[PDB]
PDB file of C-alpha atoms and ligand atoms in Angstrom:
ATOM      1  CA  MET A   1      54.965 114.776  46.615  1.00  0.00           C
ATOM      2  CA  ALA A   2      52.454 113.087  48.941  1.00  0.00           C
ATOM      3  CA  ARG A   3      51.921 109.339  48.394  1.00  0.00           C
ATOM      4  CA  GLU A   4      51.180 106.722  51.041  1.00  0.00           C
ATOM      5  CA  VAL A   5      53.291 103.563  51.274  1.00  0.00           C
ATOM      6  CA  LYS A   6      51.693 100.464  52.761  1.00  0.00           C
ATOM      7  CA  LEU A   7      53.895  98.104  54.730  1.00  0.00           C
ATOM      8  CA  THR A   8      53.271  95.274  57.156  1.00  0.00           C
ATOM      9  CA  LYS A   9      54.802  95.642  60.601  1.00  0.00           C
ATOM     10  CA  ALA A  10      57.682  93.296  59.630  1.00  0.00           C
ATOM     11  CA  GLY A  11      58.140  95.191  56.401  1.00  0.00           C
ATOM     12  CA  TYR A  12      58.385  98.426  58.366  1.00  0.00           C
ATOM     13  CA  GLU A  13      60.862  97.195  60.959  1.00  0.00           C
ATOM     14  CA  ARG A  14      62.866  95.839  57.992  1.00  0.00           C
ATOM     15  CA  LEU A  15      63.311  99.296  56.390  1.00  0.00           C
ATOM     16  CA  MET A  16      64.259 100.662  59.826  1.00  0.00           C
ATOM     17  CA  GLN A  17      67.094  98.143  60.253  1.00  0.00           C
ATOM     18  CA  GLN A  18      68.220  99.032  56.755  1.00  0.00           C
ATOM     19  CA  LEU A  19      68.214 102.689  57.732  1.00  0.00           C
ATOM     20  CA  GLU A  20      70.215 101.813  60.851  1.00  0.00           C
ATOM     21  CA  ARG A  21      72.796  99.938  58.795  1.00  0.00           C
ATOM     22  CA  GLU A  22      73.065 102.766  56.267  1.00  0.00           C
ATOM     23  CA  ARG A  23      73.734 105.347  58.927  1.00  0.00           C
ATOM     24  CA  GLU A  24      76.620 103.279  60.307  1.00  0.00           C
ATOM     25  CA  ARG A  25      78.066 102.819  56.824  1.00  0.00           C
ATOM     26  CA  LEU A  26      77.794 106.586  56.340  1.00  0.00           C
ATOM     27  CA  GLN A  27      79.725 107.199  59.564  1.00  0.00           C
ATOM     28  CA  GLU A  28      82.493 104.877  58.383  1.00  0.00           C
ATOM     29  CA  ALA A  29      82.352 106.378  54.880  1.00  0.00           C
ATOM     30  CA  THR A  30      82.582 109.926  56.273  1.00  0.00           C
ATOM     31  CA  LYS A  31      85.455 108.946  58.592  1.00  0.00           C
ATOM     32  CA  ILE A  32      87.525 107.419  55.787  1.00  0.00           C
ATOM     33  CA  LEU A  33      86.804 110.383  53.530  1.00  0.00           C
ATOM     34  CA  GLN A  34      88.399 112.810  56.025  1.00  0.00           C
ATOM     35  CA  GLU A  35      91.450 110.624  56.641  1.00  0.00           C
ATOM     36  CA  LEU A  36      91.675 110.506  52.862  1.00  0.00           C
ATOM     37  CA  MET A  37      91.734 114.295  52.683  1.00  0.00           C
ATOM     38  CA  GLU A  38      94.417 114.932  55.288  1.00  0.00           C
ATOM     39  CA  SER A  39      96.708 112.280  53.740  1.00  0.00           C
ATOM     40  CA  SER A  40      96.921 112.794  49.961  1.00  0.00           C
ATOM     41  CA  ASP A  41      96.196 116.563  50.116  1.00  0.00           C
ATOM     42  CA  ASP A  42      96.003 116.348  46.308  1.00  0.00           C
ATOM     43  CA  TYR A  43      92.405 115.210  45.828  1.00  0.00           C
ATOM     44  CA  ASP A  44      92.381 115.063  42.041  1.00  0.00           C
ATOM     45  CA  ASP A  45      93.148 111.384  42.675  1.00  0.00           C
ATOM     46  CA  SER A  46      90.594 108.755  41.652  1.00  0.00           C
ATOM     47  CA  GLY A  47      90.515 107.601  45.248  1.00  0.00           C
ATOM     48  CA  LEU A  48      89.260 110.748  46.931  1.00  0.00           C
ATOM     49  CA  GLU A  49      86.733 110.956  44.055  1.00  0.00           C
ATOM     50  CA  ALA A  50      85.501 107.405  44.527  1.00  0.00           C
ATOM     51  CA  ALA A  51      85.136 108.175  48.245  1.00  0.00           C
ATOM     52  CA  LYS A  52      83.221 111.398  47.541  1.00  0.00           C
ATOM     53  CA  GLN A  53      80.832 109.356  45.408  1.00  0.00           C
ATOM     54  CA  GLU A  54      80.331 106.569  47.981  1.00  0.00           C
ATOM     55  CA  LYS A  55      79.391 108.912  50.842  1.00  0.00           C
ATOM     56  CA  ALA A  56      76.982 110.775  48.559  1.00  0.00           C
ATOM     57  CA  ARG A  57      75.676 107.425  47.403  1.00  0.00           C
ATOM     58  CA  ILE A  58      74.988 106.381  50.996  1.00  0.00           C
ATOM     59  CA  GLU A  59      73.444 109.778  51.705  1.00  0.00           C
ATOM     60  CA  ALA A  60      71.003 109.047  48.931  1.00  0.00           C
ATOM     61  CA  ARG A  61      69.888 105.619  50.118  1.00  0.00           C
ATOM     62  CA  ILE A  62      69.323 107.159  53.557  1.00  0.00           C
ATOM     63  CA  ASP A  63      67.354 110.259  52.591  1.00  0.00           C
ATOM     64  CA  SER A  64      65.276 108.017  50.297  1.00  0.00           C
ATOM     65  CA  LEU A  65      64.724 105.613  53.239  1.00  0.00           C
ATOM     66  CA  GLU A  66      63.570 108.362  55.607  1.00  0.00           C
ATOM     67  CA  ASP A  67      61.148 109.484  52.956  1.00  0.00           C
ATOM     68  CA  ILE A  68      59.595 106.073  52.499  1.00  0.00           C
ATOM     69  CA  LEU A  69      59.305 105.765  56.260  1.00  0.00           C
ATOM     70  CA  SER A  70      57.620 109.140  56.699  1.00  0.00           C
ATOM     71  CA  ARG A  71      54.848 108.002  54.325  1.00  0.00           C
ATOM     72  CA  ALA A  72      54.455 104.578  55.867  1.00  0.00           C
ATOM     73  CA  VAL A  73      50.942 103.309  56.669  1.00  0.00           C
ATOM     74  CA  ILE A  74      50.902 100.008  58.516  1.00  0.00           C
ATOM     75  CA  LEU A  75      48.575  97.333  57.154  1.00  0.00           C
ATOM     76  CA  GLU A  76      46.623  95.068  59.499  1.00  0.00           C
ATOM     77  CA  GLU A  77      48.511  91.907  60.438  1.00  0.00           C
ATOM     78  CA  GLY A  78      46.291  89.334  58.785  1.00  0.00           C
ATOM     79  CA  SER A  79      45.519  91.179  55.554  1.00  0.00           C
ATOM     80  CA  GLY A  80      45.454  90.872  51.783  1.00  0.00           C
ATOM     81  CA  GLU A  81      46.381  87.776  49.808  1.00  0.00           C
ATOM     82  CA  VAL A  82      49.499  85.712  50.287  1.00  0.00           C
ATOM     83  CA  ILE A  83      52.046  84.906  47.605  1.00  0.00           C
ATOM     84  CA  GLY A  84      51.809  81.272  46.561  1.00  0.00           C
ATOM     85  CA  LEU A  85      52.367  79.137  43.491  1.00  0.00           C
ATOM     86  CA  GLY A  86      51.048  80.639  40.280  1.00  0.00           C
ATOM     87  CA  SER A  87      50.961  84.068  41.935  1.00  0.00           C
ATOM     88  CA  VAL A  88      52.221  87.062  39.986  1.00  0.00           C
ATOM     89  CA  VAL A  89      54.127  89.518  42.187  1.00  0.00           C
ATOM     90  CA  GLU A  90      54.913  93.200  41.572  1.00  0.00           C
ATOM     91  CA  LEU A  91      57.928  94.646  43.467  1.00  0.00           C
ATOM     92  CA  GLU A  92      59.469  98.134  44.057  1.00  0.00           C
ATOM     93  CA  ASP A  93      63.049  98.837  45.188  1.00  0.00           C
ATOM     94  CA  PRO A  94      62.602 101.544  47.849  1.00  0.00           C
ATOM     95  CA  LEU A  95      65.654 103.504  46.744  1.00  0.00           C
ATOM     96  CA  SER A  96      65.676 103.435  42.942  1.00  0.00           C
ATOM     97  CA  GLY A  97      61.904 103.025  42.719  1.00  0.00           C
ATOM     98  CA  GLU A  98      62.551 100.208  40.232  1.00  0.00           C
ATOM     99  CA  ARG A  99      59.604  97.975  39.428  1.00  0.00           C
ATOM    100  CA  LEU A 100      60.098  94.244  39.059  1.00  0.00           C
ATOM    101  CA  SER A 101      57.453  91.734  38.127  1.00  0.00           C
ATOM    102  CA  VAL A 102      57.774  88.007  38.596  1.00  0.00           C
ATOM    103  CA  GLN A 103      55.592  84.907  38.800  1.00  0.00           C
ATOM    104  CA  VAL A 104      56.340  81.920  41.002  1.00  0.00           C
ATOM    105  CA  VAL A 105      55.719  78.560  39.310  1.00  0.00           C
ATOM    106  CA  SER A 106      56.913  74.949  39.637  1.00  0.00           C
ATOM    107  CA  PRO A 107      60.535  74.156  38.639  1.00  0.00           C
ATOM    108  CA  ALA A 108      59.570  72.894  35.147  1.00  0.00           C
ATOM    109  CA  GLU A 109      57.323  75.871  34.371  1.00  0.00           C
ATOM    110  CA  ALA A 110      60.148  78.368  35.058  1.00  0.00           C
ATOM    111  CA  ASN A 111      60.953  80.450  32.017  1.00  0.00           C
ATOM    112  CA  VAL A 112      62.936  83.628  31.601  1.00  0.00           C
ATOM    113  CA  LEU A 113      61.111  84.506  28.349  1.00  0.00           C
ATOM    114  CA  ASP A 114      57.512  84.685  29.669  1.00  0.00           C
ATOM    115  CA  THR A 115      55.951  88.107  30.188  1.00  0.00           C
ATOM    116  CA  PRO A 116      56.209  88.344  33.934  1.00  0.00           C
ATOM    117  CA  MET A 117      59.183  85.953  34.119  1.00  0.00           C
ATOM    118  CA  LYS A 118      58.335  82.588  35.605  1.00  0.00           C
ATOM    119  CA  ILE A 119      60.464  81.775  38.672  1.00  0.00           C
ATOM    120  CA  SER A 120      60.902  78.274  40.051  1.00  0.00           C
ATOM    121  CA  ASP A 121      59.102  77.419  43.263  1.00  0.00           C
ATOM    122  CA  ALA A 122      62.347  76.182  44.776  1.00  0.00           C
ATOM    123  CA  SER A 123      64.500  78.890  43.239  1.00  0.00           C
ATOM    124  CA  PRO A 124      66.209  81.396  45.542  1.00  0.00           C
ATOM    125  CA  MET A 125      63.898  84.288  44.704  1.00  0.00           C
ATOM    126  CA  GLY A 126      60.907  81.982  44.638  1.00  0.00           C
ATOM    127  CA  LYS A 127      61.667  80.879  48.192  1.00  0.00           C
ATOM    128  CA  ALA A 128      62.184  84.387  49.487  1.00  0.00           C
ATOM    129  CA  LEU A 129      58.764  85.442  48.122  1.00  0.00           C
ATOM    130  CA  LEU A 130      56.596  82.434  48.849  1.00  0.00           C
ATOM    131  CA  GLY A 131      54.590  83.186  51.974  1.00  0.00           C
ATOM    132  CA  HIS A 132      54.652  86.991  51.898  1.00  0.00           C
ATOM    133  CA  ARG A 133      52.014  89.657  51.292  1.00  0.00           C
ATOM    134  CA  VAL A 134      51.724  93.250  50.170  1.00  0.00           C
ATOM    135  CA  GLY A 135      53.649  95.473  52.513  1.00  0.00           C
ATOM    136  CA  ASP A 136      56.360  92.963  53.346  1.00  0.00           C
ATOM    137  CA  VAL A 137      59.958  93.746  52.448  1.00  0.00           C
ATOM    138  CA  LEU A 138      62.348  91.042  51.284  1.00  0.00           C
ATOM    139  CA  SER A 139      66.066  90.922  50.655  1.00  0.00           C
ATOM    140  CA  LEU A 140      66.957  89.376  47.305  1.00  0.00           C
ATOM    141  CA  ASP A 141      70.384  88.083  46.299  1.00  0.00           C
ATOM    142  CA  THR A 142      72.042  90.219  43.605  1.00  0.00           C
ATOM    143  CA  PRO A 143      75.496  89.967  42.014  1.00  0.00           C
ATOM    144  CA  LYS A 144      76.106  93.700  42.324  1.00  0.00           C
ATOM    145  CA  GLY A 145      74.462  93.756  45.733  1.00  0.00           C
ATOM    146  CA  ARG A 146      71.748  92.200  47.869  1.00  0.00           C
ATOM    147  CA  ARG A 147      68.778  94.520  47.471  1.00  0.00           C
ATOM    148  CA  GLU A 148      65.554  94.684  49.392  1.00  0.00           C
ATOM    149  CA  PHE A 149      62.243  95.008  47.576  1.00  0.00           C
ATOM    150  CA  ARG A 150      58.697  95.755  48.704  1.00  0.00           C
ATOM    151  CA  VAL A 151      55.645  93.676  47.700  1.00  0.00           C
ATOM    152  CA  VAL A 152      53.535  96.269  45.931  1.00  0.00           C
ATOM    153  CA  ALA A 153      50.861  93.854  44.812  1.00  0.00           C
ATOM    154  CA  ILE A 154      50.087  90.235  44.098  1.00  0.00           C
ATOM    155  CA  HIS A 155      47.895  90.205  40.956  1.00  0.00           C
ATOM    156  CA  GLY A 156      48.337  86.426  40.680  1.00  0.00           C
TER     157      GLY A 156
ATOM    158  CA  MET B   1      73.761 110.040  63.651  1.00  0.00           C
ATOM    159  CA  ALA B   2      71.586 107.660  65.708  1.00  0.00           C
ATOM    160  CA  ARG B   3      69.666 109.391  68.496  1.00  0.00           C
ATOM    161  CA  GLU B   4      66.108 108.674  69.591  1.00  0.00           C
ATOM    162  CA  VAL B   5      63.657 111.588  69.729  1.00  0.00           C
ATOM    163  CA  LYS B   6      60.779 111.423  72.198  1.00  0.00           C
ATOM    164  CA  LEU B   7      57.389 112.785  71.121  1.00  0.00           C
ATOM    165  CA  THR B   8      53.859 112.558  72.408  1.00  0.00           C
ATOM    166  CA  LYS B   9      51.265 111.147  70.025  1.00  0.00           C
ATOM    167  CA  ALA B  10      50.109 114.760  69.592  1.00  0.00           C
ATOM    168  CA  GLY B  11      53.670 115.984  69.039  1.00  0.00           C
ATOM    169  CA  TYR B  12      54.288 113.389  66.339  1.00  0.00           C
ATOM    170  CA  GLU B  13      50.992 114.310  64.674  1.00  0.00           C
ATOM    171  CA  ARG B  14      52.035 117.971  64.679  1.00  0.00           C
ATOM    172  CA  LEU B  15      55.378 117.364  62.950  1.00  0.00           C
ATOM    173  CA  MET B  16      53.682 115.164  60.384  1.00  0.00           C
ATOM    174  CA  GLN B  17      51.245 118.012  59.774  1.00  0.00           C
ATOM    175  CA  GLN B  18      54.224 120.362  59.465  1.00  0.00           C
ATOM    176  CA  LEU B  19      55.816 117.920  56.986  1.00  0.00           C
ATOM    177  CA  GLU B  20      52.650 117.863  54.836  1.00  0.00           C
ATOM    178  CA  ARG B  21      52.570 121.664  54.736  1.00  0.00           C
ATOM    179  CA  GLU B  22      56.223 121.840  53.681  1.00  0.00           C
ATOM    180  CA  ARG B  23      55.721 119.355  50.849  1.00  0.00           C
ATOM    181  CA  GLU B  24      52.835 121.586  49.693  1.00  0.00           C
ATOM    182  CA  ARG B  25      55.154 124.578  49.699  1.00  0.00           C
ATOM    183  CA  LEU B  26      57.693 122.559  47.743  1.00  0.00           C
ATOM    184  CA  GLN B  27      55.109 121.880  45.022  1.00  0.00           C
ATOM    185  CA  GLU B  28      54.275 125.601  44.766  1.00  0.00           C
ATOM    186  CA  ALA B  29      57.964 126.577  44.960  1.00  0.00           C
ATOM    187  CA  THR B  30      58.994 123.935  42.391  1.00  0.00           C
ATOM    188  CA  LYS B  31      56.325 124.962  39.894  1.00  0.00           C
ATOM    189  CA  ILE B  32      57.305 128.618  40.405  1.00  0.00           C
ATOM    190  CA  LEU B  33      61.034 128.299  39.728  1.00  0.00           C
ATOM    191  CA  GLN B  34      60.176 126.488  36.510  1.00  0.00           C
ATOM    192  CA  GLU B  35      57.807 129.233  35.329  1.00  0.00           C
ATOM    193  CA  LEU B  36      60.489 131.758  36.359  1.00  0.00           C
ATOM    194  CA  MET B  37      62.927 129.749  34.225  1.00  0.00           C
ATOM    195  CA  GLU B  38      61.063 129.849  30.899  1.00  0.00           C
ATOM    196  CA  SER B  39      60.253 133.595  31.238  1.00  0.00           C
ATOM    197  CA  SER B  40      63.278 135.755  32.223  1.00  0.00           C
ATOM    198  CA  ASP B  41      65.811 133.479  30.435  1.00  0.00           C
ATOM    199  CA  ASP B  42      68.519 135.553  32.126  1.00  0.00           C
ATOM    200  CA  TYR B  43      68.981 133.595  35.379  1.00  0.00           C
ATOM    201  CA  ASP B  44      71.339 136.328  36.601  1.00  0.00           C
ATOM    202  CA  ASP B  45      68.332 138.207  37.989  1.00  0.00           C
ATOM    203  CA  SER B  46      67.712 138.438  41.772  1.00  0.00           C
ATOM    204  CA  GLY B  47      64.428 136.601  41.191  1.00  0.00           C
ATOM    205  CA  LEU B  48      65.297 133.141  39.831  1.00  0.00           C
ATOM    206  CA  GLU B  49      68.022 132.820  42.486  1.00  0.00           C
ATOM    207  CA  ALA B  50      65.677 133.907  45.296  1.00  0.00           C
ATOM    208  CA  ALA B  51      63.632 131.092  43.826  1.00  0.00           C
ATOM    209  CA  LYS B  52      66.128 128.286  43.789  1.00  0.00           C
ATOM    210  CA  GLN B  53      67.251 129.438  47.267  1.00  0.00           C
ATOM    211  CA  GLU B  54      63.608 129.098  48.456  1.00  0.00           C
ATOM    212  CA  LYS B  55      63.223 125.612  46.934  1.00  0.00           C
ATOM    213  CA  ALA B  56      66.483 124.553  48.564  1.00  0.00           C
ATOM    214  CA  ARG B  57      65.342 125.998  51.886  1.00  0.00           C
ATOM    215  CA  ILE B  58      62.137 123.995  51.613  1.00  0.00           C
ATOM    216  CA  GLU B  59      63.933 120.778  50.678  1.00  0.00           C
ATOM    217  CA  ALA B  60      66.085 121.124  53.824  1.00  0.00           C
ATOM    218  CA  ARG B  61      63.150 121.765  56.133  1.00  0.00           C
ATOM    219  CA  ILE B  62      61.573 118.644  54.627  1.00  0.00           C
ATOM    220  CA  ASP B  63      64.541 116.285  54.853  1.00  0.00           C
ATOM    221  CA  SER B  64      65.351 117.490  58.360  1.00  0.00           C
ATOM    222  CA  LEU B  65      61.733 116.708  59.272  1.00  0.00           C
ATOM    223  CA  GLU B  66      61.867 113.220  57.715  1.00  0.00           C
ATOM    224  CA  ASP B  67      65.012 112.535  59.706  1.00  0.00           C
ATOM    225  CA  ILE B  68      63.379 113.459  63.002  1.00  0.00           C
ATOM    226  CA  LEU B  69      60.184 111.476  62.371  1.00  0.00           C
ATOM    227  CA  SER B  70      62.315 108.449  61.457  1.00  0.00           C
ATOM    228  CA  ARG B  71      63.768 108.553  64.970  1.00  0.00           C
ATOM    229  CA  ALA B  72      60.463 109.283  66.675  1.00  0.00           C
ATOM    230  CA  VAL B  73      59.904 107.241  69.847  1.00  0.00           C
ATOM    231  CA  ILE B  74      56.280 107.629  70.962  1.00  0.00           C
ATOM    232  CA  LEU B  75      55.899 108.205  74.708  1.00  0.00           C
ATOM    233  CA  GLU B  76      53.163 106.750  76.905  1.00  0.00           C
ATOM    234  CA  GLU B  77      50.029 108.905  76.952  1.00  0.00           C
ATOM    235  CA  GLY B  78      49.968 109.898  80.630  1.00  0.00           C
ATOM    236  CA  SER B  79      53.688 110.303  81.198  1.00  0.00           C
ATOM    237  CA  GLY B  80      56.258 112.642  82.655  1.00  0.00           C
ATOM    238  CA  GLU B  81      55.497 115.748  84.656  1.00  0.00           C
ATOM    239  CA  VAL B  82      53.529 118.606  83.150  1.00  0.00           C
ATOM    240  CA  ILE B  83      54.374 122.263  82.523  1.00  0.00           C
ATOM    241  CA  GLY B  84      52.919 124.574  85.149  1.00  0.00           C
ATOM    242  CA  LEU B  85      53.731 127.800  86.975  1.00  0.00           C
ATOM    243  CA  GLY B  86      57.279 127.758  88.297  1.00  0.00           C
ATOM    244  CA  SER B  87      58.314 125.086  85.773  1.00  0.00           C
ATOM    245  CA  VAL B  88      61.611 125.415  83.917  1.00  0.00           C
ATOM    246  CA  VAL B  89      61.207 124.349  80.301  1.00  0.00           C
ATOM    247  CA  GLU B  90      63.859 123.502  77.721  1.00  0.00           C
ATOM    248  CA  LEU B  91      62.832 123.588  74.061  1.00  0.00           C
ATOM    249  CA  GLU B  92      64.517 122.581  70.782  1.00  0.00           C
ATOM    250  CA  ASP B  93      63.699 123.761  67.276  1.00  0.00           C
ATOM    251  CA  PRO B  94      63.660 120.472  65.324  1.00  0.00           C
ATOM    252  CA  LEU B  95      64.959 122.271  62.230  1.00  0.00           C
ATOM    253  CA  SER B  96      67.827 124.442  63.471  1.00  0.00           C
ATOM    254  CA  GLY B  97      68.343 122.320  66.553  1.00  0.00           C
ATOM    255  CA  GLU B  98      68.215 125.572  68.505  1.00  0.00           C
ATOM    256  CA  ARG B  99      67.850 125.187  72.243  1.00  0.00           C
ATOM    257  CA  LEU B 100      65.700 127.587  74.225  1.00  0.00           C
ATOM    258  CA  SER B 101      65.192 127.670  77.953  1.00  0.00           C
ATOM    259  CA  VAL B 102      62.409 129.585  79.717  1.00  0.00           C
ATOM    260  CA  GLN B 103      60.504 129.586  83.030  1.00  0.00           C
ATOM    261  CA  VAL B 104      56.723 130.097  83.405  1.00  0.00           C
ATOM    262  CA  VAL B 105      55.901 132.444  86.290  1.00  0.00           C
ATOM    263  CA  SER B 106      53.250 134.978  87.311  1.00  0.00           C
ATOM    264  CA  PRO B 107      52.870 138.178  85.205  1.00  0.00           C
ATOM    265  CA  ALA B 108      54.648 140.136  87.940  1.00  0.00           C
ATOM    266  CA  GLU B 109      57.533 137.669  88.225  1.00  0.00           C
ATOM    267  CA  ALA B 110      58.269 138.066  84.502  1.00  0.00           C
ATOM    268  CA  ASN B 111      61.864 139.076  83.846  1.00  0.00           C
ATOM    269  CA  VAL B 112      63.911 138.814  80.655  1.00  0.00           C
ATOM    270  CA  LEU B 113      67.168 139.235  82.601  1.00  0.00           C
ATOM    271  CA  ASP B 114      66.833 136.210  84.885  1.00  0.00           C
ATOM    272  CA  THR B 115      68.879 133.184  83.818  1.00  0.00           C
ATOM    273  CA  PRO B 116      66.222 131.005  82.322  1.00  0.00           C
ATOM    274  CA  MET B 117      64.211 134.101  81.444  1.00  0.00           C
ATOM    275  CA  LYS B 118      60.953 134.397  83.381  1.00  0.00           C
ATOM    276  CA  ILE B 119      57.870 134.321  81.136  1.00  0.00           C
ATOM    277  CA  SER B 120      54.446 135.582  82.247  1.00  0.00           C
ATOM    278  CA  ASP B 121      51.766 132.981  82.915  1.00  0.00           C
ATOM    279  CA  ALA B 122      49.234 134.747  80.703  1.00  0.00           C
ATOM    280  CA  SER B 123      51.856 135.681  78.128  1.00  0.00           C
ATOM    281  CA  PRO B 124      51.797 134.226  74.576  1.00  0.00           C
ATOM    282  CA  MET B 125      54.562 131.642  74.915  1.00  0.00           C
ATOM    283  CA  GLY B 126      53.417 130.950  78.459  1.00  0.00           C
ATOM    284  CA  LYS B 127      49.871 130.164  77.449  1.00  0.00           C
ATOM    285  CA  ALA B 128      51.224 127.869  74.695  1.00  0.00           C
ATOM    286  CA  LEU B 129      53.461 125.905  77.116  1.00  0.00           C
ATOM    287  CA  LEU B 130      51.199 125.543  80.157  1.00  0.00           C
ATOM    288  CA  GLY B 131      49.727 122.074  80.418  1.00  0.00           C
ATOM    289  CA  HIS B 132      52.176 120.234  78.196  1.00  0.00           C
ATOM    290  CA  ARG B 133      54.782 117.533  78.817  1.00  0.00           C
ATOM    291  CA  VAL B 134      58.018 116.243  77.330  1.00  0.00           C
ATOM    292  CA  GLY B 135      57.353 115.068  73.799  1.00  0.00           C
ATOM    293  CA  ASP B 136      54.791 117.734  72.896  1.00  0.00           C
ATOM    294  CA  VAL B 137      55.502 120.124  70.004  1.00  0.00           C
ATOM    295  CA  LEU B 138      54.231 123.711  70.160  1.00  0.00           C
ATOM    296  CA  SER B 139      54.025 126.439  67.543  1.00  0.00           C
ATOM    297  CA  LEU B 140      55.403 129.720  68.937  1.00  0.00           C
ATOM    298  CA  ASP B 141      54.707 133.169  67.436  1.00  0.00           C
ATOM    299  CA  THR B 142      57.756 134.886  65.939  1.00  0.00           C
ATOM    300  CA  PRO B 143      57.954 138.078  63.877  1.00  0.00           C
ATOM    301  CA  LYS B 144      60.256 136.209  61.449  1.00  0.00           C
ATOM    302  CA  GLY B 145      58.033 133.138  61.357  1.00  0.00           C
ATOM    303  CA  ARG B 146      55.874 131.030  63.618  1.00  0.00           C
ATOM    304  CA  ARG B 147      58.279 128.178  64.387  1.00  0.00           C
ATOM    305  CA  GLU B 148      57.635 124.891  66.157  1.00  0.00           C
ATOM    306  CA  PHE B 149      59.507 123.723  69.239  1.00  0.00           C
ATOM    307  CA  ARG B 150      59.736 120.438  71.077  1.00  0.00           C
ATOM    308  CA  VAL B 151      59.554 120.123  74.870  1.00  0.00           C
ATOM    309  CA  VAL B 152      62.811 118.319  75.559  1.00  0.00           C
ATOM    310  CA  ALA B 153      62.435 118.424  79.341  1.00  0.00           C
ATOM    311  CA  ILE B 154      60.773 120.242  82.246  1.00  0.00           C
ATOM    312  CA  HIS B 155      63.460 120.368  84.929  1.00  0.00           C
ATOM    313  CA  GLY B 156      61.176 122.729  86.817  1.00  0.00           C
TER     314      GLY B 156
HETATM  315 ZN1   ZN C   1      83.788 114.095  41.135  1.00  0.00          ZN
HETATM  316 ZN1   ZN C   2      65.347 112.504  54.444  1.00  0.00          ZN
HETATM  317 ZN1   ZN C   3      60.888 113.147  51.145  1.00  0.00          ZN
HETATM  318 ZN1   ZN C   4      51.535  76.793  36.713  1.00  0.00          ZN
HETATM  319 ZN1   ZN C   5      55.571  87.869  55.832  1.00  0.00          ZN
HETATM  320 ZN1   ZN C   6      75.493  87.170  40.892  1.00  0.00          ZN
HETATM  321 ZN1   ZN C   7      73.730 103.209  64.766  1.00  0.00          ZN
HETATM  322 ZN1   ZN C   8      60.367 130.195  51.909  1.00  0.00          ZN
HETATM  323 ZN1   ZN C   9      66.086 114.672  50.192  1.00  0.00          ZN
HETATM  324 ZN1   ZN C  10      63.254 114.657  49.840  1.00  0.00          ZN
HETATM  325 ZN1   ZN C  11      69.230 112.447  57.293  1.00  0.00          ZN
HETATM  326 ZN1   ZN C  12      69.766 110.813  58.905  1.00  0.00          ZN
END
């Protein structure tokens, strides 16, 4: 298990802040879990179980985050291509290791059906990406939860 | 759990090197417990469980290491005092968080009974320490296993 992960300075400091946030959430999560154990001694309750799960969950995002960081290799500042119109961008979610491909195009070229989905220039995600390069880390709006992805490559 | 850990460029390089080694051992240990799983189907043998235990041990050494590197704060090259004769040195074992205190003196001043035990100048541990500063990481001989310690401070 030895792979290098390229990140720009900004992309690196971005995963740090995320690690900082996660540790605080863990502290709060841990704290509530104990107060939840002393109270309803009976922990066969869905609550105590949902709490168990949340802490563990946070533990996961953090251990995964420390891993990514330990493999980090900082790219030069001015380096690689930039993401612009027509560019096809490959993304990885640090935690889940989920791959996501998307291509930024003009508003009228946007289409959900295309192979790498075509995203409007002025769409939320299109904005967020436009201007970034491999290594950068961006936060993208999600219904279930704002996630941060890493620019793995810009084939476009 | 948010504490900064000071390391010298050399100290950081040494823990990274230790991390690499441990991942290696996790590959070998992982592959082994799987071979030991298809053979003696009966997992109730003192072998397969001495195997998972080992893999678990390794995974802990690794994650503990990733945690420490994530908090690394690189110190200025020429910084802090240096360890010499008469210097009191406090050390911490990154893994177990064990704290050890020792004082480098002349071979004839050596005494295990003195508060911070007095270690010979030309002794093993003494040679290893001499010439280092806070932040450095040193591998110290142990019958149980050459472990690595961090110079937390040289109050001497
Ligand atoms: Zn459960
Ligand atoms: Zn970790
Ligand atoms: Zn890892
Ligand atoms: Zn177009
Ligand atoms: Zn950028
Ligand atoms: Zn939504
Ligand atoms: Zn904090
Ligand atoms: Zn072992
Ligand atoms: Zn882990
Ligand atoms: Zn791990
Ligand atoms: Zn941790
Ligand atoms: Zn941690």
